[PDB]
């Protein structure tokens, strides 16, 4: 399915997890001193690719990037 | 930061650029001289 | 106050409208008296 | 319980807000950081629902906004009447209406406009109008210019009163909300006074002023000899000579001896032979009958005295077996949301404007309209196009209500709630009808277009070959011919000569004629039904799925107007209720563009044309509609290619401007495709590289440039697409008929 | 770089690349991209701020 | 799964044969009060006093519904994934804490220590099965 | 030219002068138009064909109108550029573009008649252009 990649420029807004409709994302802690918050993509099978996460990311350019790929019943949002 | 987006390595006069340009300009004046029957 | 009214003309549309009308009026003025021009006459 | 509450000095009248643009919203008020702020400043200007949540400020803004709008319409109508006074040939048109063309515009002697001023008769060189105001002012009884001058001044005065009112009712004297919510008082007042008494007064005008004036002018009396309207009131001998019913006076009215007024109140039900137009006496009997009906109809609702209905009671009691709670909760919707009221008022008003166009051509209600083929088409076309736009707006605001103002608590198992539940069944079946009609209605043209090319006319769906006769319409036609003396015993003639009767010839031209329905008309009426159903499919789907969909469950939080939700789920593009409206407008165009061509070709072919004294009619195209309108090539050959000859050859004549705008309209239509096909992703990249050149030369702008938004690019396209589309037919219809 | 200083950003794949900007503050910690910067020109999303590293910045 | 279905007469927008054949999801929640709420796909329904249950064709319908319930001040919403063999799993709050808030048990998944700007050029990676974003 | 002759020898031009089609309110505008048009060369169709070759004899066709535009056009661009750079120094720059501070603009609009003289000064110096490293460019 699709792949959501999260890069070093995260700052811990948490907005990506909120805008997501499918709960593909989760905020995890960082062992480092940067912050106690990093975005993750644990369940990418439910990613549909609506790019709402990329609309809520206030970086110079996207810390969290969604790369489209192979399709499935879930990623296409087909209730039939 | 691999490739610089701006070019470098040229001096104010730009001799090599100007020499070929003035030559191309001279042919145009020559064809014009043939058009006006100056030659 | 009068200052508030001047800024309304200072805005883009009212300023653009008055200027282009003055600009257009000059051309319509010139084409009236001097009817048709395609080239400058040659002395 | 319908009191008049008015607040005192709600808002000041300072000029300071003019200085600061963006006072609408907190976002726009901050500043213009980018160029999208400029486009957003306009797209939200009349969106009062976004500015303030307080419903009072919404209604006060709207009530004052209508007043400024009426000032515009009154200034417009006054200008038409003013142009009729100074720059017009109306006074010459009255003496010789048939052989003189109507004109009201004069271009100035400058670079070469002056060719547009053409000989239209009456010693006047000007543009030939097609609005029909000359026929209107004649029906009103205006016989000189000064009398026409005074009416223009009153409109400007009336315009100022409307303009003064909105200031008065927004700055000084603002009504509260519950003053607006008294809908029961609103309906009584509008029905009885605006529509009832307004019609009643016009009956007094037609009886006193118009009908005697029209009768004298029709009987050969010169305009100089016709008395003025005031003289009829003072001297009653004049009315008695024309209408002897006045000799009895008002006593027969109160004693119910209404037969005495049979002279000037009639049911002739036909057109005046001398002037193509309905009898003024019927128009007098007309408005008198309707005023009583409207005045009666208004008293239904309660309005503080206990006598009448609560509309809530009528709706709630109209439930049934298949609809659980019925109309319970709707009255709260119409009273809560302005958008829902707009959707109803705009949709049905649009359908009126189409119905009006249909009644007017078959029943010309003004003198000398039928002979003026130019005025009939332009009126029939303009009204259909207006009604088409309004009907589409009704679906838009229906969706805006559903996104913003729809409450699930109120609409709980009501009629609206059930429709949303089985929205799938409504659309899947409507989809089947659209495919069924499109195959049959249009595929039959392809079969005829194919068979004729193969050389098999025996197999066409034609009048001589296999034929599809509209037997039901042929039958309903026949009843209206036999209704006079049958099911309409007091009717002398059929209601319209289009249904049947005999040919009516005003001068050399035919005013109206029976419209025989053949196989060609069978197909076209289904084409119209086909295009209308698809337009409903696009719009109705926009309303029901505006709130949610299987593809997008939460479509309301995104809003009514949003471009997409990402490239996920396949592609979620043009899923909003806005984008459905954007699509329906193209189909509204395709729906109505055939209507005006069906009217233009048939009337030219079957109805209109010069008639000989011996009884032979020579139509304009001569039966071209019967055999050629069953194939697409015929519409391309006999209608578009043939009738457009006057347009392209209009250069060097008074009609040359039509050939230009006919040509320039093709530009804007193609210019639309630049926006519809393309996309913002390209254009911001091009603006990027162009900004580099300005940053180089230090011409960079402070307001950073930004490409047009996605939905805006669709909005601009449909604007050009319809503007360049309609304007083409506008010049094609004008120049072809003004020459013919 | 110090507080209030104007700097040219050298990071590519950025909207304000090769453009000046004022340093609002610096995080005195071991975090990557500590320096906060504010520019006059907004980006496409309208953020008007972003954190950047010291190596990318040059003191104008 | 135990709960009362919200009372609504039915709607064409709902579960299809994909529910029985492939998978269906179910959302459960507890209420203080019986109220009216808009369903994820068309219509309105009257949620019961406590322990409500609803079967939804997709996971998006539930989280979309969960946002609506939060506006009614209900945060004890739970989603399940029901397979045709009856298998049920606690899908959305796999950890009891919500995804927005932090928990120690979680770990990084698909993290790139580099920046997007430092991605490798694709010409460096061709005829190898590798993608640039890895 | 291509079968191109002077006006008076051309028979086509003689006929078109009779069919005047007077443009302006002046009754003899049509005759005065064709009279002034005698200088240009007319083809077989009888319409004047301009020559933009650059001959001094026919500078009125394009060359004289050519210079008249560029002087006007540089006035517009130079005034726009100076007005824009002047705004950039002030505090609120965005609002000034929409709402024009005429106190700043009209002095700048007054200047511009000698736009080439001010242009060459910024041309010789680095005022006209900017460094490529200063400008933003995509990767
Ligand atoms: C490519 C675009 C273009 C170009 C190059 C021109 C150029 C010209 N047009 Mg034209 N025109 C255009 C677009 C264009 N127009 C458009 C879009 C339309 C409308 C659809 C017209 C309609 C039009 C008409 C109807 C007429 C012209 C005329 C003219 C000529 C004289 C203008 C004049 O009096 O100067 C202005 C006069 C001056 C004295 C210069 C003063 C300069 C400033 C203001 C002084 C300060 C000139 C050759 C006229 C012509 O050919 O006459 C022979 C004429 O009658 N044009
Ligand atoms: C007597 C003068 C006067 C003055 C000083 C004001 C002043 C004000 N009015 Mg007001 N108003 C007036 C008359 C006046 N009004 C009248 C006569 C009406 C009845 C129509 C209204 C109805 C009215 C409403 C309903 C509202 C205001 C509002 C306002 C405030 C903000 C207006 C603003 O910034 O936009 C200034 C806008 C303009 C100058 C543009 C106006 C465009 C006119 C009306 C239409 C032109 C149509 C034109 C023919 C179209 C051609 C198109 C084509 C040729 C291109 C401000 C205090 C608003 C307010 O209080 O905000 C909270 C508000 O909601 N007014
Ligand atoms: C729907 C509104 C409307 C429209 C479109 C027009 C359109 C026109 N009017 Mg007009 N007019 C109107 C309402 C309108 N009028 C009203 C309400 C009055 C009475 C107050 C007048 C009184 C009037 C006069 C007295 C004259 C016109 C003239 C004109 C023409 C030239 C316009 C012009 O030079 O603009 C100029 C624009 C600006 C200065 C800005 C044009 C066809 C003129 C005309 O046709 O002369 C032959 C003319 O002399 N109008
Ligand atoms: C009684 C009529 C009526 C009324 C009162 C409204 C009122 C409204 N509409 Mg609406 N609408 C109507 C009819 C009406 N509409 C019709 C008939 C259609 C179908 C075409 C629509 C389609 C429609 C859409 C699709 C949308 C609205 C929206 C809105 C709201 C905001 C619009 C706004 O900010 O205005 C400002 C609007 C503009 C500045 C657009 C200008 C369009 C120009 C006039 C087009 C050019 C036409 C012109 C004749 C061309 C020739 C001249 C030109 C060459 C110079 C507002 C409540 C918006 C909304 O979401 O509501 C909340 C929205 O998105 N309307
Ligand atoms: C000429 C161009 C054209 C055509 C043919 C169509 C056709 C269609 N559009 Mg459409 N559309 C168009 C342009 C066109 N569109 C444009 C430009 C837009 C943008 C505004 C849209 C926007 C649009 C929307 C928004 C909607 C449609 C819908 C429809 C469908 C209506 C159902 C119907 O008529 O039955 C099908 C009829 C035909 C295809 C007509 C010709 C068929 C012939 C008679 C049969 C072919 C002969 C034979 C079998 C061929 C066999 C060959 C063999 C060798 C394979 C239909 C598929 C609606 C829809 O899908 O609802 C069902 C809908 O909602 N369209
Ligand atoms: C889409 C509309 C349409 C229709 C209605 C027709 C109709 C016809 N075509 Mg034709 N055609 C069309 C489009 C159409 N054409 C197009 C688009 C082309 C171009 C490719 C052609 C090209 C063409 C050629 C080249 C020829 C025809 C011919 C014919 C005729 C013979 C049909 C035949 O043999 O099929 C037989 C039909 C069937 C076996 C099935 C019909 C389906 C039935 C009626 C369904 C009924 C459903 C029922 C009511 C529901 C039950 C409900 C339940 C509860 C009980 C007939 C008049 C022939 C001819 O010579 O014409 C005289 C011929 O040679 N056609
Ligand atoms: C550097 C400045 C420059 C200058 C002063 C000229 C000067 C000239 N060019 Mg020219 N030209 C230039 C750059 C220049 N060119 C460039 C950069 C290109 C490439 C697009 C051309 C392409 C070009 C063509 C294609 C033609 C001219 C022609 C002409 C002559 C026009 C006739 C005349 O004098 O009046 C003139 C001598 C014309 C000429 O001489 O025709 C006989 C001609 O046909 N030029
Ligand atoms: C042709 C002349 C013979 C080639 C000469 C050649 O290729 O040498 C190339 C030579 C190189 O000069 P540069 O400074 O570019 O050398 C750069 C080196 O320093 C790089 O390390 O340039 C000239 O000769 C300048 C004069 C040519 C003038 C050309 C205009 C006349 C056209 C005829
Ligand atoms: C059949 C006539 C409608 C008869 C009709 O609507 O029945 C009306 C019937 C009445 O139920 P109620 O008595 O509860 O309605 C009471 C009303 O006061 C509540 O609105 O309701 C239904 O059976 C729903 C069926 C709607 C769907 C019926 C199919 C409609 C097809 C589309 C329209 C075709 C028009 C073709 C002619 C132009
Ligand atoms: C061309 C195009 C653009 C770009 C269009 C733009 C940028 C239109 C710009 C219109 C005007 C000309 C901008 C400048 C307005 C100035 C105020 C005018 C100067 C003032 C004088 C005229 C007085 C899109 O953004 C787009 C988006 C989505 C789908 C298709 C398209 C599309 O086709
Ligand atoms: S930068 Fe993007 S991914 Fe990082 S916390 Fe903010 S919204 Fe989430
Ligand atoms: S594309 Fe959609 S599913 Fe994927 S992370 Fe963004 S919001 Fe979540």
PDB file of C-alpha atoms and ligand atoms in Angstrom, chain C residues 16 20, chain D residues 39 674-675 678-680 683 687 707-709 713, ligand 10:
ATOM      1  CA  UNK C  16      -7.480  52.611 -11.919  1.00  0.00           C
ATOM      2  CA  UNK C  20      -7.978  54.817 -17.441  1.00  0.00           C
TER       3      UNK C  20
ATOM      4  CA  UNK D  39      -9.979  37.371  -5.142  1.00  0.00           C
ATOM      5  CA  UNK D 674      -7.553  27.418 -20.964  1.00  0.00           C
ATOM      6  CA  UNK D 675      -8.859  27.328 -17.387  1.00  0.00           C
ATOM      7  CA  UNK D 678      -5.385  23.277 -17.236  1.00  0.00           C
ATOM      8  CA  UNK D 679      -4.483  23.365 -13.556  1.00  0.00           C
ATOM      9  CA  UNK D 680      -2.947  25.590 -10.906  1.00  0.00           C
ATOM     10  CA  UNK D 683       0.625  28.108 -13.402  1.00  0.00           C
ATOM     11  CA  UNK D 687       4.654  32.646 -12.132  1.00  0.00           C
ATOM     12  CA  UNK D 707      -2.057  31.496  -9.159  1.00  0.00           C
ATOM     13  CA  UNK D 708      -5.835  31.291  -9.047  1.00  0.00           C
ATOM     14  CA  UNK D 709      -7.290  28.703  -6.701  1.00  0.00           C
ATOM     15  CA  UNK D 713     -10.149  28.314 -12.134  1.00  0.00           C
TER      16      UNK D 713
HETATM   17  C1  LIG H  10      -4.288  30.847 -16.625  1.00  0.00           C
HETATM   18  C2  LIG H  10      -4.659  30.077 -15.394  1.00  0.00           C
HETATM   19  C3  LIG H  10      -4.281  30.491 -14.170  1.00  0.00           C
HETATM   20  C4  LIG H  10      -3.460  31.730 -13.986  1.00  0.00           C
HETATM   21  C5  LIG H  10      -4.294  32.984 -14.174  1.00  0.00           C
HETATM   22  C6  LIG H  10      -4.007  34.166 -13.633  1.00  0.00           C
HETATM   23  C7  LIG H  10      -2.789  34.352 -12.726  1.00  0.00           C
HETATM   24  C8  LIG H  10      -4.988  35.308 -13.948  1.00  0.00           C
HETATM   25  C9  LIG H  10      -4.471  36.712 -13.636  1.00  0.00           C
HETATM   26  C10 LIG H  10      -5.483  37.791 -14.045  1.00  0.00           C
HETATM   27  C11 LIG H  10      -4.972  39.282 -13.898  1.00  0.00           C
HETATM   28  C12 LIG H  10      -4.503  39.792 -15.249  1.00  0.00           C
HETATM   29  C13 LIG H  10      -3.829  39.456 -12.835  1.00  0.00           C
HETATM   30  C14 LIG H  10      -3.334  40.910 -12.669  1.00  0.00           C
HETATM   31  C15 LIG H  10      -4.419  41.914 -12.323  1.00  0.00           C
HETATM   32  C16 LIG H  10      -3.783  43.305 -12.234  1.00  0.00           C
HETATM   33  C17 LIG H  10      -4.374  44.049 -11.052  1.00  0.00           C
HETATM   34  C18 LIG H  10      -4.054  44.060 -13.545  1.00  0.00           C
HETATM   35  C19 LIG H  10      -3.173  45.326 -13.645  1.00  0.00           C
HETATM   36  C20 LIG H  10      -3.970  46.620 -13.395  1.00  0.00           C
HETATM   37  C21 LIG H  10      -4.243  47.375 -14.704  1.00  0.00           C
HETATM   38  C22 LIG H  10      -4.965  46.486 -15.700  1.00  0.00           C
HETATM   39  C23 LIG H  10      -5.116  48.576 -14.412  1.00  0.00           C
HETATM   40  C24 LIG H  10      -4.644  29.726 -12.954  1.00  0.00           C
HETATM   41  O1  LIG H  10      -4.309  30.084 -11.845  1.00  0.00           O
HETATM   42  C25 LIG H  10      -5.435  28.510 -13.106  1.00  0.00           C
HETATM   43  C26 LIG H  10      -5.792  27.779 -11.987  1.00  0.00           C
HETATM   44  C27 LIG H  10      -6.542  26.624 -12.115  1.00  0.00           C
HETATM   45  C28 LIG H  10      -6.938  26.194 -13.366  1.00  0.00           C
HETATM   46  C29 LIG H  10      -6.582  26.924 -14.489  1.00  0.00           C
HETATM   47  C30 LIG H  10      -5.831  28.081 -14.367  1.00  0.00           C
HETATM   48  C31 LIG H  10      -5.460  28.847 -15.560  1.00  0.00           C
HETATM   49  O2  LIG H  10      -5.807  28.466 -16.655  1.00  0.00           O
END
